[PDB]
């Protein structure tokens, strides 16, 4: 009796409209290698909770001026955490992620009609690119730099550079067909963007569990994300292209920025 | 899983406050069946229903409330088909909170009310032995259905004016029993009552006028009726004669 894998339950009343969720640190998103330990909430995860609520409360979903500001922390203790959704205007919501009371991230949201879905040229794109890496050698340059260096690089394929952008070949792990089916986002898409981004940092010139984001927009449920087109947006900001087989976009993310010591 | 044996799910969004419930027919509170067909939803069913929501919709919570000028217009039919009934809320200018039953791509209201929260400073008893010496008839549980499934029924005193029905209530008191304040097979004990105290068919609607609840969980050992079919008034009390419910302008609709 779960609406989705983190909003577990619709608990609005008199005063809200909002749905609240029990973690312990084991769950879908939060999982990690060989149990837990206190950590930060991840990053997308707090993405797919405002959407799973937003979603609830009511195709393509518009996400904009995402913020979260003060890192929900997990695995320590058991956290409840609500999802709170307010009126904003005539065609926008606004969401709140809270627990105890601290809000930890907050956004606006709109419905609209995706008129133009757009598209990357993959074999192009390809074409373009100076180097070709495996994962390893991703992992062996990013160990070399101080600031930048992870642990792993399952998800990665092969990673396509080119001035300016990097297209990153994901094979992201496997998730059951019907765990699958409620998530836009996959658990494990953090793990595998992560050192590309700063690969693609390092190569043009730590995380404290903050972040923002400008503009999120959504085109499709379920969709299939084959490749990661990284760019720099027109302290580190980035654009973010999530993109199938044939290059047409599910997830587009304009101004991602996330948070360092 | 369920929030109450008659509210299973939240289900509020951005145009409502609301809880729904799916249905079949074979659950306890229907379980006195004459056959596995189509029936009406019980009387007392849409007032247990309306009451969890409320209480669901606030929460500190207060014991004492009064829903009036309830009414039941179009009967909900359970047993045939997998029925999903929901219970809205909206809250008012007063702060009195109104309430609907309805069910169904064209949308039917079965049931609608009032409801307020409120302090009840004297909660109203029954002089019991007095009530009992006035009466001119006792009749064993056997006599009572002599004249008429149905059980829960020890004794009853008739007067000229009301019966006194002495209740042999199973008294679960489980985690599911907890959760409701009318009993269940309770909801069945208003289907003679119109029947003991006169001495056609009930077509599932009902209109009440005032509803008081004096306590969460109350113990109800006896029902007082009188004459406010036509319409009455109903005291549910404890041995001590102490009042946990109190029904008044309660009209059940006949079907000819």
């Known amino acids: 009796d779960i609406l989705h894998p983190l909003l577990h339950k619709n608990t609005s009343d008199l005063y809200e409209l909002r749905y609240s969720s029990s973690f312990t640190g084991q769950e879908l998103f939060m999982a990690d290698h060989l149990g837990n330990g206190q950590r930060f909430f991840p990053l997308i995860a707090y993405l797919e909770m ?70 990357l040229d993959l074999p192009a794109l390809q074409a373009e690119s100076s180097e070709i890496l495996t994962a390893r050698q991703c992992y062996e340059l990013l160990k070399e730099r101080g600031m930048a260096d992870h642990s792993e690089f399952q998800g990665i394929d092969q990673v396509y550079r080119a001035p300016g952008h990097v297209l990153v070949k994901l094979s992201l792990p496997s998730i059951t067909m019907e765990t699958a089916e409620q998530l836009v986002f996959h658990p494990s898409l953090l793990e595998s963007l992560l050192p590309s981004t700063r690969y693609l940092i390092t190569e043009a010139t730590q995380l404290d569990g903050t972040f923002t984001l400008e503009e999120l927009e959504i085109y499709e449920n379920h969709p299939a994300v084959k490749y990661a087109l990284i760019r720099f947006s027109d302290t580190a900001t980035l654009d973010i292209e999530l993109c199938d087989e044939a290059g047409r976009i599910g997830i587009r993310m304009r101004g991602f920025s996330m948070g360092s010591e």
């Open 50 to 119: 405002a959407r799973a609520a937003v979603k609830q409360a009511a195709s393509g979903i518009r996400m904009s001026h995402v913020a979260t500001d003060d890192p929900l922390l997990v695995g320590d203790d058991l956290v409840q955490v609500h999802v709170g959704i307010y009126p904003e205007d005539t065609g926008e919501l606004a969401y709140k992620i809270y627990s105890e009371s601290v809000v930890h991230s907050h956004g606006m949201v709109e419905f609209t009609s995706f008129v133009e879905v757009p598209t």
